[PDB]
Amino acid sequence: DLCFTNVYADSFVIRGDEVRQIAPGQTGKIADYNYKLPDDFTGCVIAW
Amino acid sequence: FGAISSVLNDILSRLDPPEAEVQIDRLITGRLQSLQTYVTQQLIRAAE
Secondary structure (H helix, E strand, C coil), X not given: CCCCCCCCCCCCCCCHHHXXXXXXXXXXXXXXXXXXXXXXXXXXXXXX | CCCCCCCHHHHHHHCCHHHHHHHHHHHHXXXXXXXXXXXXXXXXXXXX
C-alpha cells in the first residue's frame, strides 16, 4: 500500500548464530566490523 | 525522573544509544516539566 522513493537491496551470506546481529542497535562481530544498520532503520530484513 | 541516573554524562557513557536515548528522553521530559512549572509560577507571581 506504500510508495517509496528508492529501494536498496543488500545481499550477503551469514551463518545462523549471527542472523540476529542484523538489526538496529545490535552488538556483534557482523554488526561492528562488517555491516551495521542505522538505529532509525526503515525496511525489512529477509533471510533463508 | 525514573531514569537510571540523574547525571547525563554517565548515562551517555554507560549505555549505548538504543536505550540511552530512552533514558535521556525521560530526563528531558522531567526537566521540561519542571521548567514549565517554574515559568507558570513566575508568570502568576509577575501578574500579582
